[PDB]
């Protein structure tokens, strides 16, 4: 587990992290201002469970709160008010802890940054930007969803609480955090929300002022037909529009051009995502997942948010092949620990380990099988990856002895190693 810019100088910290999206959507209506006393107890059995790193909801109290249709939301974090991190996943204190044993541990925590907007009309907080003075989006005149003089991004629904984050007082603001959850928090990096709200140099620059070293990851969303008919990305792929983002920021990205074809494709078609890319300098800034808090379901009420849920029958299949391939890997809690996807995933990732997968190892995709066919090269071992296909044995695909890794699902979801 080194650590190290990619040749690009893309920080993605040694290529060779592993992490568990240490929250699901409801925490903070399943476990009300309990969430670090349990991630502190389970600190060991997280290490124990091979995870070199836990990405963190967001610290920053969260009072929101919404109601639309029969739903209801807020304190999740996304809409925070300050900085303070007394909110509804336990108090400062407890952070401190949770950070500490996790670190004791052996994994590194990641943190989830929202610099886009804040919770403006909250009455009892510890920030207040005034109107006029430029540190708001709508200071600007705001005619629609893009870049304004007060916003270099795109905005957060109405955009009456986006953030100039561009503003020397915001940057700097955002910039003296970062430097606290770094060396109060125990911070080995960040997760950088909503990353279409402003500009990826910004995030390249918030990075070499105050974790230059560290690991980051940006959460880009936005498909080719958001951009504007006359911009490249219109008509450009999934890929090639992360691949950007990653550039200019020098952070890891997530896939969601895997995502997007997990979704809408076969399992053939899973080897369009950005970690199936025959250049490891483009593979290896993919930060791959199943699901997460947005598209995926939780526990409690709703099912949770569920925007773009994978079918529940490619659960298995998924996880094998975020495990055994390239780009950095992350495990949704849920599967973890409350659906009972926990031995299969333990198992896959002891097979990442010993083969030495790491984010810019080889990866070729055999054709004249059903299904998705791979051969991953790690610097230890090599595996052979069969999900959902007709393949008869290894040998037909790849040279040398081979021994039964993993086989579920009846065959469906078959590794085979040196
Ligand atoms: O003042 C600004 C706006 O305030 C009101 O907006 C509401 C939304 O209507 C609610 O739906 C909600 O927003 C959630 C959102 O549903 C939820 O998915 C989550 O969003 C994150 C996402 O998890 C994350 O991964 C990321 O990439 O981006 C999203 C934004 O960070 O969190 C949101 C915020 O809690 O709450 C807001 C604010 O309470 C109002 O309806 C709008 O008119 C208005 O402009
Ligand atoms: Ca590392
Ligand atoms: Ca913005």
Redesign the pocket.
Known sequence: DQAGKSPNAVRYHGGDEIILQGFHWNVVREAPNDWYNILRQQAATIAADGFSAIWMPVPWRDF?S?S?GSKS??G?G??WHDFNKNGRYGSDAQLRQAASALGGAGVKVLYDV?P??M???YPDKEINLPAGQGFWRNDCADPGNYPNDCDDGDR??????DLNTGHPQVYGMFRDEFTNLRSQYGAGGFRF??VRGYAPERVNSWMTDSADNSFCVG?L?KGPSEYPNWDWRNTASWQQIIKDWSDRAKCPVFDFALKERMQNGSIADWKHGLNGNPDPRWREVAVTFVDN??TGYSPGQNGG?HHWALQDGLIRQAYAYILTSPGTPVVYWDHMYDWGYGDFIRQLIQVRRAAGVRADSAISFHSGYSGLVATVSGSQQTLVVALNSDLGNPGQVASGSFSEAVNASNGQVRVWRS
């Not at 957060?156 to 609480?161: C, L, P, S, T």
């Open positions: 929101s919404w639309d939301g807020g999740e996304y809409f929202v886009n907007h919770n403006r009309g957060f629904i109405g955009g009456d609480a929300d909503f959460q969303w808090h947005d948010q």
